[PDB]
């Protein structure tokens, strides 16, 4: 028996935050179901699943071992991403292994040429859960027999067409997308298991409209052309006076996400989604994290710029960030503790967990330098009145 | 409302680059707010309530002066309004049930106002935003045409037909005679007010020849009509191997094929921006003349060049799904003009049938040059699907 670094964290009062009382709204759905459906009705205005909730732990197990019954290909997608639909009518999104565990993105790669890797999708779910955001839909890693579980169970002529046997006698496939869907970029098992991330599926858009927002620090997905925030140091004085960003719980929720993204090095956060039925006053669904954890010896400061320009965070997430730096807690050991509960262990190589620590204290220094320029209270909003003390 | 569902889909939430001091061409009047909103990439915005309100001005603003556009194929009038902004007026030359005869050449075809209107909505549904706004309008040809002109050459052509109806024909070339007059029943004619682009004094326009321009003569075929490898060389000639230009011609040539408009002999740009802007899809009046015939000659630019934008390809596929699809989305927005029905039902169904031919021309072309070689990617950094 061993002591859990993760057990100490979830006992701490900064992780015993209670939500407001939920009315008839704030629920998305009126109301022994499958675990994927119990996850859907558990979605409310503030979070995506809530703390603990043994459904999420058991829903991650369903993604691991439920029989894959049908597979289809998201046509016209960003890169190759598959849709797995299971025996219990719930489905999931599948991103296969594109890069090895030791690899880093080349330095000369643009953010829009980067590979999407299953390690980030998985690890982002755990990192977000450890920061008590609870905004990433649950995702479990899975080894898939790419013959019986991908090719032989699809009636999609375009995904089936790309399966071949390489001169190495391995089974390969690549589908038909835009980035890295060619014979020279095929995905080959050794010889017939490929590995990938099964991301639980958010409720069908028929019964849960989702507003898609532009985020104001969206990069100029062009070379030789900088974006507005890249030239104007007072860019956020103007964004906090623009509609949806002067009323929340919104600039502060973007500061949560933009600290999330910096910790992983994910600079491809050009949009964020909301649940619409709740309005301009709900949380940000942290989706599409596939671009993180590509570089571990490099910290991308561009992502933090929203924080240096806007200069305000939530108090809840500020003290947790400070707690995630204390040696008795701290991202690194708190992350491989959870990340060991996936089948794909190690889902993050040891230098990437080490990079979480270094990037974290850069966030604390950007807040300390920024709290030492606008003063407290102007920088740190207070969402802890009526919450466990410290 | 099927049109409500379309503009919620992410393929219609494309965002622009940040606009610099350039990329801009420049309680105002609505036509002037339309001018200053013209930028490098588009001509308006997906509301932008100015555009919708500019069509109401074209419908019901008081006509203050009318002039005659000299030397045209047919009659076109210049209506200038109470607020000094003007528009181009094309009167009704064809009824709704008529089709262009089969023995007609593309260069003998009439311009009909219903096509000018429907082309604007079709273009807005393809998220192009390249056609100047146009609204349909019934004009009392006494109070709003004859009695408010100081061009005696236009006023002189008003007469009374043996049927006690009010007629006029103007003075152009070849279809401006007593036998081609436009007669109300008894004094309303109906026509299309096409909004006017900014004056060329303060907004120069370069006009380009397109390489698939037909040889506007009988017997003589054009260059691209004999060489199936015509575009192997056209993508190596100056202006067409740098854009966003070949890609913009494929946008325009898919636009034109959908309407059957085979009279696209030239296209204009705004110059102030250079070789790197959008193509203003102007004067689309030759489309929607035939609904029982799909003119494949228009598509040859697509089979020869074999490349589209991914932006417009995915929308083309979307406009084919039964939950969206051109037909119902077109009569919905064509129901918001005064001239209802501006498109007869067989013409809207042909919009669907012609679409599935374009989607077939790309799939046959995407499985022979492959993705990436055929479909350029401009959706990096745009909303996911």
Residue numbers in the entry:
A (entry chain C): 131 to 161, 198 to 556
B (entry chain E): 134 to 159, 198 to 556
From the paper:
The Fam20 proteins are recently identified kinases that regulate essential cellular processes by phosphorylating proteins and proteoglycans. The human genome encodes three Fam20 paralogs: Fam20A, Fam20B, and Fam20C13. Remarkably, each has a distinct biochemical activity. Here, we use a combination of structural biology, biochemistry, and phylogenetics to elucidate the molecular functions and evolutionary relationships of the three Fam20 kinases.
The human Fam20C protein crystallized but the crystals diffracted poorly. To gain structural insights into the Fam20C homodimer, we crystallized a Fam20C ortholog from zebrafish (Danio rerio, drFam20C), which is 86% identical (94% similar) to human Fam20C in the kinase domain, and determined its structure. There are 12 molecules of drFam20C in the crystal asymmetric unit, which organizes into six pairs of homodimers similar in overall structure to the Fam20A−Fam20C heterodimer. All the residues that participate in the drFam20C dimer interface are conserved in human Fam20C, including residues corresponding to Phe299C, Phe300C, Phe354C, Pro357C, Glu374C, and His375C (Phe275, Phe276, Phe330, Pro333, Glu350, and His351 in drFam20C), mutations of which reduce Fam20C activity. These analyses, together with the biochemical results described above, suggest that the human Fam20C protein probably forms a similar homodimer, and that dimer formation is critical for allosterically activating kinase activity. A comparison of the drFam20C homodimer with the Fam20A−Fam20C heterodimer suggests that Fam20C uses an almost identical set of residues to interact with itself and Fam20A. All Fam20C structures obtained so far are involved in a homodimer configuration or heterodimer with Fam20A, and likely reflect an active conformation. Thus, we propose that the Fam20C homodimer plays a “house-keeping” function, whereas Fam20A is employed when Fam20C activity is in high demand.
